[PDB]
Design an enzyme around this catalytic site. Structure first.
Site, PDB file in Angstrom:
ATOM      1  N   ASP A  36     -85.471  55.976 -22.436  1.00  0.00           N
ATOM      2  CA  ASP A  36     -85.874  54.948 -21.474  1.00  0.00           C
ATOM      3  C   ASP A  36     -85.053  53.658 -21.570  1.00  0.00           C
ATOM      4  OD1 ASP A  36     -87.225  53.446 -19.566  1.00  0.00           O
ATOM      5  OD2 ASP A  36     -89.078  53.284 -20.739  1.00  0.00           O
ATOM      6  N   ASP A 232     -82.068  52.182 -14.977  1.00  0.00           N
ATOM      7  CA  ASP A 232     -83.281  52.617 -15.681  1.00  0.00           C
ATOM      8  C   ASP A 232     -83.447  54.138 -15.742  1.00  0.00           C
ATOM      9  OD1 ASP A 232     -85.731  52.832 -16.923  1.00  0.00           O
ATOM     10  OD2 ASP A 232     -86.905  52.031 -15.246  1.00  0.00           O
TER      11      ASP A 232
HETATM   12  C1  LIG Z   1     -90.345  52.352 -14.935  1.00  0.00           C
HETATM   13  N1  LIG Z   1     -90.775  52.565 -16.318  1.00  0.00           N
HETATM   14  C2  LIG Z   1     -92.062  52.657 -16.716  1.00  0.00           C
HETATM   15  O1  LIG Z   1     -93.068  52.646 -15.998  1.00  0.00           O
HETATM   16  C3  LIG Z   1     -92.074  52.965 -18.225  1.00  0.00           C
HETATM   17  C4  LIG Z   1     -92.834  51.863 -18.992  1.00  0.00           C
HETATM   18  C5  LIG Z   1     -93.472  52.330 -20.324  1.00  0.00           C
HETATM   19  C6  LIG Z   1     -94.488  51.282 -20.828  1.00  0.00           C
HETATM   20  C7  LIG Z   1     -92.373  52.528 -21.396  1.00  0.00           C
HETATM   21  O2  LIG Z   1     -94.208  53.538 -20.119  1.00  0.00           O
HETATM   22  C8  LIG Z   1     -93.733  54.571 -19.354  1.00  0.00           C
HETATM   23  C9  LIG Z   1     -94.299  55.859 -19.516  1.00  0.00           C
HETATM   24  C10 LIG Z   1     -93.815  56.942 -18.747  1.00  0.00           C
HETATM   25  C11 LIG Z   1     -92.767  56.741 -17.812  1.00  0.00           C
HETATM   26  C12 LIG Z   1     -92.282  57.804 -17.017  1.00  0.00           C
HETATM   27  C13 LIG Z   1     -93.185  58.772 -16.498  1.00  0.00           C
HETATM   28  C14 LIG Z   1     -92.717  59.832 -15.683  1.00  0.00           C
HETATM   29  C15 LIG Z   1     -91.337  59.921 -15.370  1.00  0.00           C
HETATM   30  C16 LIG Z   1     -90.439  58.949 -15.878  1.00  0.00           C
HETATM   31  C17 LIG Z   1     -89.037  59.032 -15.532  1.00  0.00           C
HETATM   32  N2  LIG Z   1     -87.911  59.083 -15.278  1.00  0.00           N
HETATM   33  C18 LIG Z   1     -90.905  57.891 -16.695  1.00  0.00           C
HETATM   34  C19 LIG Z   1     -92.208  55.447 -17.654  1.00  0.00           C
HETATM   35  C20 LIG Z   1     -92.679  54.363 -18.426  1.00  0.00           C
HETATM   36  N3  LIG Z   1     -90.641  52.920 -18.511  1.00  0.00           N
HETATM   37  C21 LIG Z   1     -89.984  52.730 -17.418  1.00  0.00           C
HETATM   38  N4  LIG Z   1     -88.607  52.619 -17.290  1.00  0.00           N
END
Ligand SMILES: CN1C(=O)[C@]2(CC(C)(C)Oc3ccc(-c4cccc(C#N)c4)cc32)N=C1N
Ligand code: NI
Length: 402
Positions: A36, A232
């Site tokens: 991430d 991202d």
């Molecule tokens: C936008 N974004 C978020 O909301 C976050 C924030 C955080 C707190 C780390 O928790 C999550 C958890 C899952 C996903 C997730 C869930 C399903 C598919 C994907 C993808 N590609 C990512 C994304 C995130 N990290 C990013 N970059």
């Protein structure tokens, strides 16, 4: 420029992110961890959850140390929370090193874990500024660089799925590479172009121009970066600010107008299908984002195809057909260059030189007529300032930075 051991070290299910195998603790406990670039905490499941087959068991690790501090992270979708600690961490298909990193042991969560994603934690690769509880919690990559001789750079080749699809009951499997500490030349072709990291918090960049099928959107370029533009790997879609999204959809609609799709399709809430192998790719336009160059008044463009912004989803009821989800969506928090963008390119997060590199990915999905492209330079006499300055809140202003 060869990193064979790290090639193909990423896996996932389409639309559910890309993960890397990591170990935590002594002896090593293997977990699958979402890669991430949109966040900055290393946070892992550390208690039973319905969607977890396994979790980090701190009591089994002789090298675990409790930091005696909790962490609470709410976000748009939900929240995760838990206990801060440190332990030994390695990436088995990564560099041959072990580091002591901060680990947030997730004890409670809401809408964080996803049924079937196969990941149990998240590797936040962005900068300390956006770490929780605050910027004093050293992110993983910072620890890796500080404790080892690993160069301050990583690169990502995210490889998308395409028809024919293997399975009808499950989402398509995806693969990729995270090269830690280097650039692997087998993962790209042609020129590697760099855009500056505007500020080290998210991987923030500046878009100076947008074209849809060669046609300039002709918007004030600040609109493209309102209120930021970021790269991202933790976002599936290309996400665009409201005004930009509306302009883009209008242009894509017009180009594809021989087909009349339901409103649900353009909202990303409904699939559209064609008979196996007959998808009319040529009716959908290419999308070009021009990014600020390293040189004043220069830019380069990255160009993606409908093969990137239309995601294959094999319908159980419509297994005869090729069905697609529209993966450009509206944002109220700026441009997000997610998997839709990254799947076209080999992306170099050159932290050492405060820049992000793009090259055509050796694994991108294309056809015989069009390819994802990285092209430049484009020179603009007296190029404007396309950056947006986020209004400063009193709370943010009141912080001290010792
Ligand atoms: C936008 N974004 C978020 O909301 C976050 C924030 C955080 C707190 C780390 O928790 C999550 C958890 C899952 C996903 C997730 C869930 C399903 C598919 C994907 C993808 N590609 C990512 C994304 C995130 N990290 C990013 N970059
Ligand atoms: Ni002070």
């Amino acid at each position: 420029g060869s990193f064979v051991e790290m090639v193909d070290n990423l896996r996932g299910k389409s639309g559910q992110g890309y993960y890397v195998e990591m170990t935590v603790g002594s002896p090593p406990q293997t977990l699958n961890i979402l890669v991430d670039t949109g966040s900055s905490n290393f946070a892992v499941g550390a208690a039973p959850h319905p969607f977890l087959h396994r979790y980090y068991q701190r009591q089994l690790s002789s090298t675990y140390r409790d930091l005696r501090k909790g962490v609470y992270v709410p976000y748009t979708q939900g929240k995760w929370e838990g206990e801060l600690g440190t332990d030994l961490v390695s990436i088995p298909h990564g560099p041959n090193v072990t580091v002591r990193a901060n680990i947030a042991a997730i004890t409670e969560s809401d809408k964080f874990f996803i049924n079937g994603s196969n990941w149990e934690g998240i590797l936040g690769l962005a900068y300390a500024e956006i770490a929780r509880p605050d910027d004093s919690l050293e992110p993983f990559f910072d620890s890796l660089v500080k404790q080892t001789h690993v160069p301050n750079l990583f690169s990502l080749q995210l490889c998308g799925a395409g028809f024919p699809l293997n399975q009808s009951e499950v989402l398509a499997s995806v693969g990729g590479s995270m090269i830690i500490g280097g650039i692997d030349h087998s993962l790209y072709t042609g020129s590697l172009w760099y855009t500056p990291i505007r500020r080290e918090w998210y991987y923030e960049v500046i878009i100076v121009r947008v074209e849809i099928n060669g046609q300039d959107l002709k918007m004030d370029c600040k609109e493209y970066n309102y209120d930021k533009s970021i790269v991202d790997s933790g976002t599936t879609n290309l996400r665009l600010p409201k005004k930009v999204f509306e302009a883009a959809v209008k242009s894509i609609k017009a180009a594809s107008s021989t087909e009349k799709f339901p409103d649900g399709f353009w909202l990303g809430e409904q699939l559209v299908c064609w008979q196996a192998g007959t998808t009319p790719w040529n009716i959908f336009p290419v999308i070009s984002l021009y990014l600020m160059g390293e040189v004043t008044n220069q830019s380069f463009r990255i160009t993606i195809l409908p093969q990137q912004y239309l995601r294959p989803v094999e319908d159980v009821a419509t297994s005869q057909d090729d069905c697609y989800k529209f993966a450009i969506s509206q944002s109220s928090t700026g441009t997000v260059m997610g998997a839709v963008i990254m799947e076209g390119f080999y992306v170099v997060f050159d932290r050492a030189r405060k820049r992000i590199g793009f090259a055509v990915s050796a694994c991108h999905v294309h056809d015989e007529f069009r390819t994802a492209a990285v092209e430049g330079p484009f020179v603009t006499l007296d190029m404007e300032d396309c950056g947006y300055n986020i209004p400063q809140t009193d709370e943010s202003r009141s912080h001290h930075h010792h």
